[PDB]
Amino acid sequence: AMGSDASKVVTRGPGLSQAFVGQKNSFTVDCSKAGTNMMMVGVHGPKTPCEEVYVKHMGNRVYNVTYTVKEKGDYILIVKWGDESVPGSPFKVKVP
Amino acid sequence: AMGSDASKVVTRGPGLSQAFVGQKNSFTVDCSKAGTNMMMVGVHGPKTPCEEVYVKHMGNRVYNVTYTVKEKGDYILIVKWGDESVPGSPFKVKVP
Q1: Measured distance CA(B73)–CA(B61) in Å, rounded
Q2: Which residues precede gaps in chain B, with C-N > 2.5 A?
Q3: Of the candidates A89, A63, A77, A86, which has an alpha carbon nearest to the alpha carbon of residue A19?
Q4: Which of A21, A50, A55, A80 to mutate against chain B (most B CBs within 10 Å)?
Q5: Across the interface, do A44 and B38 touch by the CB < 8 Å criterion?
Q6: Extended beta strands in chain B, E state
Q7: Which of A69, A86, A78 is nearest to A35 (CA)?
Q8: How many Cβ atoms from other residues are within 10 Å of residue A60's Cβ?
């Protein structure tokens, strides 16, 4: 479809709610039903920034996202399709 | 500083204006003077999505961004600090 519809994006995985220092933290963002746009991911650390963010297209606008963190705390994960928040965003991520 | 100021983000590199199929395309996003927020990157392909997007923190909220593309065309690259476009965004990227 020509346009886009963020409400049709489906996001799931452990990295939506918890992340660990020293590990890869991941989730899937399925934009296959949402039209044509850019998927954007941001991780807000209140004190220390996110170290790596990696977004891999798996086909059909299904993406795997992996990210890493360096410090414990409560982070906020934002996933957008264009300028529009996908269902569930912002996500609260605990780094224990 | 507690808040944030997208207007202080400095973005530079070849990947802001051109990207090649089969290569890593890169630029630096220097957020060291912009306070505390998430840096978000999106690459809009009108026909075929961006394959990989990778954002690496280099220290002091200076980031290296690398991305890959699969199809020729004119792409749009968006760089945000929080929900605010950084100077220069949106960037027009030719994939020849």
Answers
A1: 31
A2: none
A3: A77
A4: A55
A5: yes
A6: 10-12, 25-30, 39-44, 52-57, 62-68, 73-81, 84-85, 91-95
A7: A86
A8: 11
* Domains identified in chain B and CATH numbers: 1-96 (2.60.40.10)
> How far is residue B8 from each of residues A12, A38, A57, measured CA to CA in Å?
34, 24, 31
**Are residues B38 and A50, on separate chains, in Cβ contact within 8 Å?**
yes
| Nearest of B39, B41, B40, B26 to residue B76 by alpha carbon | B41
d(CA B5, CA A83): 18
Resolution of the structure in the document, Å: 1.4
Contact A88, A12 (CB under 8 A): no
Q: Are A4 and A35 in contact (CB under 8 A)?
A: yes
